[PDB]
Design an enzyme around this catalytic site. Structure first.
Site, PDB file in Angstrom:
ATOM      1  N   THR A 157      -2.582   2.975   0.379  1.00 50.01           N
ATOM      2  CA  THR A 157      -2.455   4.395   0.608  1.00 50.01           C
ATOM      3  C   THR A 157      -3.628   5.090  -0.126  1.00 50.01           C
ATOM      4  O   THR A 157      -3.693   5.088  -1.354  1.00 50.01           O
ATOM      5  CB  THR A 157      -1.124   4.850   0.101  1.00 50.01           C
ATOM      6  OG1 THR A 157      -0.119   4.189   0.899  1.00 50.01           O
ATOM      7  CG2 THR A 157      -0.933   6.331   0.248  1.00 50.01           C
ATOM      8  N   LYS A 173       0.320  -5.400  -2.982  1.00 49.57           N
ATOM      9  CA  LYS A 173       0.951  -4.226  -2.342  1.00 49.57           C
ATOM     10  C   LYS A 173       1.272  -4.717  -0.916  1.00 49.57           C
ATOM     11  O   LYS A 173       0.801  -4.336   0.155  1.00 49.57           O
ATOM     12  CB  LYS A 173       0.018  -3.036  -2.315  1.00 49.57           C
ATOM     13  CG  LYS A 173       0.751  -1.719  -2.044  1.00 49.57           C
ATOM     14  CD  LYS A 173      -0.200  -0.603  -2.595  1.00 49.57           C
ATOM     15  CE  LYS A 173       0.376   0.802  -2.596  1.00 49.57           C
ATOM     16  NZ  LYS A 173       1.458   0.973  -3.551  1.00 49.57           N
ATOM     17  N   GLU A 179       7.483  -1.094 -14.396  1.00 49.90           N
ATOM     18  CA  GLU A 179       6.777  -0.007 -13.691  1.00 49.90           C
ATOM     19  C   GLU A 179       7.730   1.061 -13.182  1.00 49.90           C
ATOM     20  O   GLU A 179       8.893   1.050 -13.494  1.00 49.90           O
ATOM     21  CB  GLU A 179       5.903  -0.564 -12.558  1.00 49.90           C
ATOM     22  CG  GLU A 179       6.786  -1.254 -11.448  1.00 49.90           C
ATOM     23  CD  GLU A 179       5.993  -1.949 -10.367  1.00 49.90           C
ATOM     24  OE1 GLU A 179       4.765  -2.136 -10.499  1.00 49.90           O
ATOM     25  OE2 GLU A 179       6.638  -2.332  -9.331  1.00 49.90           O
TER      26      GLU A 179
END
Ligand SMILES: *Cc1c(COP(=O)(O)O)cnc(C)c1O
Ligand SMILES: *Cc1c(COP(=O)(O)O)cnc(C)c1O
Ligand SMILES: [Cl-]
Ligand SMILES: [Cl-]
Ligand SMILES: [Cl-]
Lengths: 270, 270
Positions: A28, A139, A172
């Protein structure tokens, strides 16, 4: 804007492996003046995912296609999804697979500047990150853990949630990385069992070393987090959110957190 | 044959959450004589997945749509994917999501009868199944561990691969479940941390209990596997393959194994 394989297309084959098995990767990218911010870092992570998942993407031809998409978009967010492409039988990666490159554009999302300025309260998510070293850091499209964690709260008082692994180690956020300062040492949780190695995390670690801040990448416990000098979240869309609270824990906004915000704001227009 | 939402359609939006995050479920149904075999077991699994993932699917209506699709197909395999549907923002499940219902038809997979008659040799996969109780048992779309495991071998001398969890417990095959027999007890590895709760596994547990075979569900070590009296794999497509070897371990085709094959042959068209 939606492209599939470099041509306008808003749909893809219901037999795609990205849909069947989450067999693919995504990035992204923030877009400003027709070009992607932190492009090299997004490309480095995508390429490493393609290597580890053995997806035969030509990442060089992709940079061209991506650059043309960002020029058409001008300003906002460009989401790239790479899948292994069409599925034949079942799980086996097909021999002569052709990867699908999907590009979708969106406006800048509405990340509130007050989170950057005043900091945020984290939700203590109960959804844990499973420990899977083969996917750790990438990712990839298998994001049901993030979907389940995100669903644990829907209120405006919590801007992000804290994800721990199944040994309750601090890992995270739901959509950002977490970093903390323990003795004027900037500490990033080790992401070799689970988590996403963020582009902003990579950028901030390098910038902090640039300015003489002692770094460590290591396991971090909940007890250590509670006693941290300062805590913050980062990602490539909002930059840095200082963390002020988690359940009964509070932290002031820290000096290092402010110094890095000032660097990101002046250098890269976060 | 490919339908989306009960209408002929071979594509779906590139913005769908099943593609973005693997936010969805599937069922692979054997179709025989115009009808889905073990239909109620597939729909029970899909329903329990929709409940645990909060996907607002009308399972009653889906049953009617699936029945019409399978009658159109006549014989083969109908794969159903259900996704949370279109993606507005990021990970948060959208408020008023309309799930997508994708049905694709295929020929039967081509399985050698020798696998049923004489049994198979397992490949000893290195890819481990991570432990995530929120997803355990569900036939969800986050299937990259199956993709990586299946990628470990491409030869015809191994029909399936054995998957262990991250603490070396014996869990299942890459695409089928594993069961064992010890001193007359049918033993199924416990799927509470990971693995997919097979519809054939559920069928066979109920069949075995129905004929007075004692059942046990528990954690199984490699050492226990090695000393089992019988080992077999099962799934909705191939039924039962006796396990004859794994590395140096060897087992005969067992008595309870062959009794359950005869039930599948006599009662379910195998
Ligand atoms: C993308 C992502 C991050 C960090 O992202 P960057 O934008 O790459 O810094 C962290 N966690 C999850 C779960 C993500 O999807
Ligand atoms: C589908 C599946 C099974 C067992 O499947 P049934 O066809 O439901 O009997 C076992 N393991 C995995 C990983 C699967 O996808
Ligand atoms: Cl409809
Ligand atoms: Cl052999
Ligand atoms: Cl342990």
């Amino acid at each position: 804007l939606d492209w599939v394989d470099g041509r306008p297309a808003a749909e893809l084959s219901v037999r795609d492996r990205g849909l069947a098995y989450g067999d693919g990767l995504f990035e992204t990218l923030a877009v400003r003046a027709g070009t992607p911010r932190l492009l090299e870092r997004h490309l480095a992570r995508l390429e490493e995912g393609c290597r580890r998942l053995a997806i035969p993407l030509d990442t060089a031809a992709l940079r061209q296609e991506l650059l043309a998409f960002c020029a058409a978009l001008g300003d906002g967010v460009a989401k790239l999804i790479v899948t292994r492409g069409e599925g034949l039988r079942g799980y086996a990666p097909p021999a002569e697979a052709s990867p699908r490159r999907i590009l979708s554009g969106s406006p800048r999302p509405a990340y509130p500047e007050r989170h950057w300025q005043q900091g945020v309260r984290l939700f203590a998510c109960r959804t844990r990150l499973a420990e899977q070293p083969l996917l750790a850091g990438l990712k990839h499209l298998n994001r049901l853990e993030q979907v389940l964690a995100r669903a644990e709260w829907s209120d405006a008082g919590h801007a992000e949630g804290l994800m721990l692994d199944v040994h309750e180690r601090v890992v995270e956020g739901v959509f950002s990385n977490l970093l903390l300062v323990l003795d004027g040492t900037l500490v990033a949780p080790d992401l070799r069992r689970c988590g996403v190695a963020g582009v902003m995390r990579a950028e901030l670690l390098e910038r902090a070393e640039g300015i003489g801040v002692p770094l460590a990448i290591r396991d971090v416990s909940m007890a250590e987090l509670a006693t941290a000098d300062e805590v913050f979240l980062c990602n490539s869309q909002f930059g840095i959110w200082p963390v002020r609270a988690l359940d009964e824990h509070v932290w002031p906004v820290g000096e290092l957190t402010r110094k890095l915000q000032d660097q990101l704001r002046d250098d890269l227009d976060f």
